[PDB]
Ligand binder design. Structure first.
Ligand code: 07D
Ligand code: 07D
Ligand code: 07D
Ligand code: 07D
Ligand code: BPH
Ligand code: BPH
Ligand code: U10
Ligand code: U10
Ligand code: CRT
Ligand code: CRT
Ligand code: FE
Lengths: 274, 44, 259, 45, 255, 45, 44, 45, 44, 45, 44, 45, 44, 45, 44, 45
């Protein structure tokens, strides 16, 4: 099935690799060679996750967990019953994410638009890789990656954040929190303004950029613009992800001590050291 | 604002502020009679 | 710049300024009026809420009374700011979506500060005014009430926060991608659909099977942002009042194996 | 009356009333937060 | 037995399930709002209204909402105004999911990245009712910031170094302050002027001329840029046509 | 005396009032903080 | 807004600031009589 | 004597007054902090 | 503003700075006679 | 003398005043922090 | 911006900076008399 | 002499002065951190 | 910037640099006589 | 011996001095991190 | 970028990099006399 | 020699310099990590 305006855009070309073989659609989904690879990796990883659930002790969705190999294994590939399944799932997921991003690139090429969307998804892929590959590799063992479970990855988050006394005192983690809260606040403001301009109340006429700028100027003192707000939102989300990656790289590969104790330098400054 | 309007508004403002200050002074006198708020050498 | 305050803005600014002055004066008095010690311990300084024995009444000024006064003034200022952003939208003949999205954040703020202490009978577990004091309040709240990770409404609030970040990273990237086709004129696209909106919808359809419109994506964003704080406020209200241990609740409801 | 040619009466009155109400509320709260002057929980002098 | 509703049910679980019900309803409503443009779905080949849908099709498409505009006209969403089934392209395979192959010149035929939406033949209007996008000649009040470089008089060059022309005017937006289009006088056929989107043009910094580089299309494609009826205003349809023609360069420039 | 041609009378008076009230409130808060001059608590001397 | 108005402003401003400072001085005298704020060598 | 041609007398006076007030407040806060010079508490010498 | 106004501004600025510095010096003299702020070798 | 033709003596003077005040404040705060040179809280030499 | 005025600016700038440096040097001499800031090998 | 042909002399002066000041401040703070060269709270050799 | 301007900047710039280096060298010499910063074999 | 046609002289000189300064700072901090080559603290051979 | 001015860069750049390397070599030699950084079979 | 027409003779040099420098830094840090080849600490064989 097609939309009322899709046939004129469903054109040949735009593939990065594979040529005409995979240039076709199955329903609404564009397939592509990287889509075929995405399906390959998704099916493999999902089947192996269900296999790990079957090997596990419970079939409860919350309690299903695929655990990484023990820290004693180091960076060596582990037996499939002792974390090798986790490693295979990790690399299949990485392949699936990369293939999804490249499929988005192919769709962007076909539609003649920018690559900002795959570029932004690259940051999510980078955060995932840093959590499952980069940080455990610089830490010396695959056991430091989070287990693939609904609750066990939360337990991993809790244990990792309490290994450093209090993760709330990580300076890059504070910046990540600030940018994550600001992204939500800005999203609420942007959606609210656009919906208030498009729906100005029953019996009223749709407003425009003048009114949109005037509203926020009158309320808070300044505005950003029509495209400045989208650029700011993208930069905010990507900066939050980047500072989260930075805090995770600092926590354990570089800094191993207590983050609350890291803040003594502020109290030891020469102009206040009494 | 005309000169006459300013003068009449000033008159009303003066009357209202005098009434307000009188009411506040009466309330303060009642509160002081009930319990003074200036401690002595040995406190309250 | 051209900030329109009005009567409601004047009220809100006066109330919030009184609250800020009270908080700052208390912080500076905590270090015996030392500018040096204030700079040294600014993060660690805080204005703590009253103890549990005072209940919801007025605690002494040195023992939480200043906190109660500052908190009430801040709450009044925030409510008057909500009224302000409602009235500005009404005056500009626009919708009150901004006011009703701010209402969710106000609901969460009241749940953290006033509503939950009202339910519990005292202000002891309210949020103190200070950077590190309120971070420590967060940590101690989670630690005392089991594990907040096991709160389902905390789960939902985190999911909607991640969804807000994900949705803004999608929407900004899409609008920048179609910015060369006039996609930044979103209301104009809503009123008269153009090739920018068509290509954005078609990209997302070909990517993940379904798409939105130039207005409905903003509806998605608005609802995600509101639901974050709404679910979080619900979780805060239910924490301690009906569930004393979130880990035990999760164990009972299958979130974790029984110890 | 010279003052009212510079300051608009509406703005002046609105600002003055807001300031006076906030000050009165603050003073009443301060009194309630004291042992001696709390009338709703009166103790001995 | 603090929060217990029954032996196993409790208040937190009850509130969680209430939120689940509300969120399902909210997803239904959000999809309803999503289906205000482009729906109902048409068959890929025949173009008739036909799709695989369930019992939720009754609630799927909402009643048309009416947007009241300051010009007195109204826009309905969904408007149920479909594009023509026949387009200037032919599928490479008889399957429904097969892609289309342009019959002639895709850039002129307006298929694929060159396709544009049939918007209203009316220019965007500001709060005062005047057209939003006008050349700088008609708007003497507006001016370019002194800290920036005026693109007027700067050569227009493509990705291969071929010069397409010179910038003679700038088209501004009065509603949202910005530069929308650049008026370029083509080197070939002197006197012919074409509109050039600003968002598709980057300045080449220190080139001693700051050549306004156009990576979209080549120099030879400038002669085929769609024209505009008026010399001081541009309609929404012409605007889309120009942006769509320029956006198709990355895919059909070397073809 | 020609100071009001330099500084706007309205803004000058409003800013002076705000600054004076801020200073008075700060000094009163300091006096409340101290023990000797806390008239509400009323410590002995 | 004019120099002629500036004469009258400055006159009224001088009168008002004198009243304000007189009230402040009287209050300070009362507070000093109640409890002085300059300690001796051995504290208060 | 040429300073009032170079600098704006309206901005210079406001900036100087703000700077002096901030400096005086800072020094008074430091004095209140010190034990010897805390005139309100009045520690013995 | 103008050159003569600058003459007057400089005159009043000098007079006001003289009175300000004189008051500051008198206050500092009073504070020094109350409690000096330069400690000796052993302290105060 | 040449400096003042390239560097505006309205911005150079303001920058110099602000930088000198910041440096003086920093050095005074350092001296207050140190024990030997803290004149307000006099310790042994 | 103009040579003669910039030259006289340098003249008055030198006349001011010499006074500033002299005041600073006198203050530093007084502080050195009070408590020197260069410890010996055995310290203070 | 051609370094000033490539680089604005004003910008070169400003950048060089700022860099020198920051480097001097950093070295002074490092010396204060070190025990041997802390001239304020001096310790015996 | 003209050639003569560049040359003038150059000569007086190196003139000011020589004085700066001389002052820095004198200060470092004084600091060296105070306490040398190069430890010996056994240490300080 | 004609690299400067390829690279802009200004950007090359503002990118090669920063690199050298950062490398020197890094090497100095690394030396500070070792007991043998720390000239500020000072230890045996 | 003119070839002659580019050659003048090359010349002065070479002279300056030679001066920089000579100074660095002198400093490294001084540090080598101070404490060599190449350990022997038995270490330091 | 035609690879210099294939690839930008500026980006090629920049990428090669950045690759060689990063490889050198990685190898030097690895050597610092190793006990045998750590010249700063200088362990015995
Ligand atoms: C021994 C301890 C002690 C003690 C028991 C005690 C009691 C109390 N004291 Mg205090 N006080 C003590 C000491 C002491 N005390 C002061 C004074 C005072 C003042 C002057 C305030 C001021 O300067 O406001 C300065 C403000 C001015 C003049 C301007 C008005 C401010 C406004 C409009 C606010 C700006 C905001 C806007 C939105 C603008 C409006 C808009 C438009 C017009 C368009 C005053 C009204 C006052 C209030 C009380 C209270 C409520 C209490 C309580 C709660 O017990 N105190 C005396 C004075 O008049 O000083 C000039 C003075 O000298 C002196 C001394 C020594
Ligand atoms: C002691 C417990 C403790 C503690 C007191 C405390 C406090 C707080 N912290 Mg912290 N934190 C603690 C623990 C701790 N903290 C985190 C992290 C963070 C982040 C990162 C978010 C992000 O960017 O996610 C970025 C997300 C990723 C990883 C994106 C990857 C996703 C990809 C590629 C896509 C996957 C797609 C599929 C599988 C397909 C789906 C298919 C279909 C639906 C069909 C961040 C901003 C953040 C939030 C808060 C806040 C607001 C608070 C509050 C309220 O106090 N914390 C670190 C991290 O992950 O950094 C990357 C991390 O590991 C770690 C630890 C150990
Ligand atoms: C031990 C620590 C710990 C822990 C291990 C863990 C885990 C994680 N959590 Mg959690 N959390 C912990 C504890 C904990 N958790 C939070 C909450 C959240 C949020 C906040 C949402 C928000 O937008 O807040 C932000 C909104 C607020 C607080 C309300 C908006 C405020 C308004 C309008 C007021 C306007 C303000 C002014 C006018 C200025 C006034 C001036 C002055 C006072 C001076 C959220 C989504 C979230 C995220 C994460 C993640 C991602 C992680 C990871 C990765 O570890 N957590 C709870 C809540 O209900 O949130 C709504 C809540 O209260 C609470 C507690 C105590
Ligand atoms: C505790 C005492 C101490 C200390 C251990 C120390 C080390 C050294 N300072 Mg010094 N200095 C100390 C104190 C201090 N200092 C200065 C400054 C500056 C400036 C001036 C700017 C300039 O252009 O100098 C001009 C720069 C020149 C002269 C560059 C020439 C460099 C050469 C030929 C090579 C240097 C290396 C050796 C000779 C190796 C021999 C070592 C051994 C045998 C073991 C600057 C770059 C500089 C160089 C150095 C050098 C060469 C040394 C060596 C190797 O001894 N010092 C700071 C300043 O003014 O910054 C703008 C500042 O404030 C401040 C303070 C507090
Ligand atoms: C970087 C900024 C934000 C961002 C952006 C972003 N995400 C994106 C995009 C963008 C711009 C897309 O275009 C793309 C998309 O199409 O979304 C609909 C996407 C996307 N990001 C998603 C989710 C997501 N994004 C997140 C976050 C973020 N992404 C950032 C906050 C998060 C979290 C945790 O905060 C999640 C959960 C998806 C909706 C989509 C990814 C689609 C995809 O990868 O498809 C290919 C893969 C599959 C269909 C399934 C693969 C299954 C694997 C074989 C197994 C993986 C197991 C896993 C490792 C663990 C699972 C258990 C967990 C409980 C631990
Ligand atoms: C949907 C949930 C998200 C959200 C949304 C949200 N927040 C919002 C809004 C929305 C939709 C607004 O519309 C509103 C806003 O205006 O945003 C710009 C706002 C807002 N939320 C804010 C912040 C905020 N949002 C946060 C987060 C979030 N809110 C969530 C992520 C957070 C955190 C903790 O993450 C914070 C801290 C504010 C910036 C703003 C509300 C502003 C407000 O209420 O201000 C009250 C007024 C004052 C404190 C007055 C101050 C006065 C000063 C002292 C100046 C001096 C005045 C004058 C001198 C006084 C008179 C003196 C005389 C009496 C002497
Ligand atoms: C279609 O497009 C649309 C527009 O366009 C037409 C728009 O416009 C907008 C509107 C969006 C914006 C205008 C900006 C959005 C971007 C962000 C949210 C990220 C950037 C975050 C900020 C700068 C915060 C801005 C929030 C404000 C101004 C709220 C105003 C509230 C008050 C006036 C109440 C009193 C103020 C208080 C109590 C604090 C408010 C917060 C700040 C002013 C920032 C915090 C500052 C401090 C507390 C200390 C720092 C002090 C400063 C900054 C001064 C000193 C200088 C320094 C640098 C330190 C949208 C959504 C939009 O869809
Ligand atoms: C300008 O405003 C904008 C809008 O627009 C106007 C918008 O819309 C949006 C977009 C935003 C929304 C629509 C709002 C909602 C978005 C969110 C809330 C974000 C969260 C998103 C989700 C929760 C949805 C996630 C769903 C995903 C990731 C899709 C999953 C897809 C797959 C798993 C398959 C991918 C398809 C492939 C690879 C091919 C097709 C596959 C099939 C049809 C099934 C299998 C097919 C076969 C068996 C036959 C073919 C098989 C082959 C070729 C062999 C393979 C071999 C194997 C067996 C493996 C934005 C941002 C925007 O700002
Ligand atoms: C255009 O010109 C006209 C015609 C107008 C003429 C006018 C001319 C005028 C008015 C000119 C003005 C000239 C002036 C005032 C010039 C001043 C020049 C000065 C003072 C120059 C000083 C230069 C200093 C330099 C270059 C010093 C560099 C030092 C460096 C890079 C040191 C680095 C040290 C390191 C990295 C050490 C680190 C050690 C530790 C341990 C700290 O590292 C961790
Ligand atoms: C010029 O003066 C300056 C500006 C310099 C003064 C300086 C001010 C400063 C520095 C201010 C800010 C300081 C800091 C560090 C502030 C940080 C604040 C933070 C981070 C706060 C975070 C959380 C706090 C929360 C969520 C608290 C909410 C409290 C509420 C809602 C309390 C409500 C209380 C009520 C309604 C009380 C009711 C009881 C009554 C009074 C009705 O009866 C007893
Ligand atoms: Fe639309």
């Amino acid at each position: 099935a097609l939309l009322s305006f899709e046939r004129k855009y469903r054109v040949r070309g735009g593939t990065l690799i594979g040529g005409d073989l995979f240039d076709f659609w199955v329903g609404p989904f564009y397939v592509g060679f990287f889509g075929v690879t995405t399906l390959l990796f998704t099916v493999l990883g999902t089947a192996l996750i269900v296999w790990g659930a079957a090997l596990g002790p419970s079939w409860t969705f919350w309690q299903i967990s695929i655990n990484p190999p023990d820290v004693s294994y180091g960076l060596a590939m582990a037996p499939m019953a002792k974390g090798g399944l986790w490693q295979i799932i990790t690399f299949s997921a990485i392949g699936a994410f990369v293939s999804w991003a490249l499929r988005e690139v192919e769709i962007c090429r076909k539609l003649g638009i920018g690559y900002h969307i795959p570029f932004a998804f690259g940051f999510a892929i980078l955060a995932y890789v840093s959590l499952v590959v980069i940080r455990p590799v610089m830490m010396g063992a695959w056991g430091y990656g989070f287990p693939y479970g609904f609750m066990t990855h939360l337990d991993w988050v809790s244990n990792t954040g309490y290994q450093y006394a209090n993760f709330h005192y990580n300076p890059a983690h504070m910046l990540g929190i600030t940018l994550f809260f600001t992204t939500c606040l800005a999203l609420a403001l942007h959606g609210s303004l656009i919906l208030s301009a498009a729906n100005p109340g029953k019996g009223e006429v749709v407003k425009g950029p003048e009114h949109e700028n005037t509203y926020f100027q009158d309320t808070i003192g300044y505005s950003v613009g029509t495209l400045g707000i989208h650029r700011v939102g993208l930069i905010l989300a990507l900066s939050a992800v980047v500072w989260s990656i930075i805090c995770m790289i600092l926590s354990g590969p570089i800094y191993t001590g207590s983050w609350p104790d890291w803040w003594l330098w502020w109290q030891k400054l020469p102009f206040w050291n009494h | 604002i005309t000169e006459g309007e300013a003068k009449e508004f000033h008159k009303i403002f003066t009357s209202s502020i005098l009434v307000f200050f009188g009411v506040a002074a009466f309330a303060h006198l009642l509160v002081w009679i009930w319990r003074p708020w200036v401690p002595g050498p040995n406190g309250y | 710049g051209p900030i329109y305050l009005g009567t409601t803005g004047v009220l809100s600014l006066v109330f919030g300024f009184f609250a800020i002055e009270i908080i700052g004066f208390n912080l500076l008095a905590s270090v015996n009026w030392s500018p040096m010690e204030f700079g040294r311990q600014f993060f660690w300084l805080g204005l703590e809420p009253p103890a549990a024995e005072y209940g919801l009444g007025f605690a002494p000024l040195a023992e939480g009374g200043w906190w109660q006064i500052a908190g009430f003034f801040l709450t009044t200022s925030i409510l008057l700011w909500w009224v302000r952003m409602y009235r500005r939208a009404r005056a500009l003949k626009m919708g009150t979506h901004t006011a009703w999205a701010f209402a969710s954040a106000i609901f969460l703020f009241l749940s953290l500060g006033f509503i939950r202490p009202l339910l519990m009978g005292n202000f002891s577990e309210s949020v103190p005014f200070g950077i590190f004091p309120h971070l420590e309040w967060t940590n101690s709240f989670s630690l005392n009430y089991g594990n907040f990770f096991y709160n389902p409404f905390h789960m939902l609030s985190i999911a909607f926060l991640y969804g807000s970040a994900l949705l803004f990273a999608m929407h900004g990237a899409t609008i920048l991608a179609v910015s060369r086709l006039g996609g930044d004129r979103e209301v104009e696209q809503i009123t008269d659909r153009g090739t920018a909106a068509e290509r954005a919808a078609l990209f997302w359809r070909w990517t993940m099977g379904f798409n939105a419109t130039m207005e409905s994506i903003h509806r998605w964003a608005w609802w995600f942002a509101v639901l974050c704080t709404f679910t979080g406020a619900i979780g805060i209200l239910l924490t301690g009042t009906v569930v004393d241990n979130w880990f035990e609740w999760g164990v009972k409801h299958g979130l974790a194996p029984a110890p | 009356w010279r003052i009212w040619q510079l300051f608009d009466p509406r703005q002046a009155l609105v600002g003055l009333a807001t300031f006076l109400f906030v000050l009165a509320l603050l003073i009443h709260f301060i009194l309630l937060s004291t042992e001696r002057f709390n009338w709703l929980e009166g103790a001995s002098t | 037995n603090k929060g217990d509703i029954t032996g196993y049910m409790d208040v937190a679980q009850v509130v969680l399930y209430a939120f689940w019900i509300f969120f399902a309803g909210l997803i239904i409503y959000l999809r309803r709002e999503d289906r205000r443009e482009g729906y109902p779905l048409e068959d890929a080949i025949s173009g008739k209204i036909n799709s695989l849908q369930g019992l939720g099709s009754v609630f799927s498409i909402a009643r048309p909402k009416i947007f009241k505009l300051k010009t007195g006209a109204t826009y309905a969403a969904p408007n149920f105004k479909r594009d023509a089934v026949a387009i200037k392209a032919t599928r490479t395979a008889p399957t429904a999911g097969a892609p289309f192959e342009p019959t002639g010149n895709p850039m002129t035929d307006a298929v694929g990245p060159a396709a544009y939406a049939l918007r209203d033949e009316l220019p965007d209007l500001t709060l005062g009712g005047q057209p939003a996008i006008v050349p700088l000649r008609v708007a003497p009040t507006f001016s370019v910031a002194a800290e920036d470089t005026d693109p007027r008089g700067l050569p227009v060059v493509d990705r291969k170094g071929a010069v397409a022309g010179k910038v003679t005017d700038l088209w501004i937006d009065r509603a949202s302050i910005a530069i929308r289009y650049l008026e370029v006088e083509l080197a070939a056929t002197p006197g012919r002027k074409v509109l050039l989107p600003f968002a598709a043009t980057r300045i080449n910094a220190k080139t001693k001329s700051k050549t306004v580089t156009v990576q979209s299309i080549l120099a030879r494609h400038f002669a085929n840029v769609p024209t505009i009826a008026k010399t001081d205003s541009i309609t929404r349809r012409e605007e889309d046509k120009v942006m769509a023609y320029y956006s198709s360069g990355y895919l059909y420039s070397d073809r």
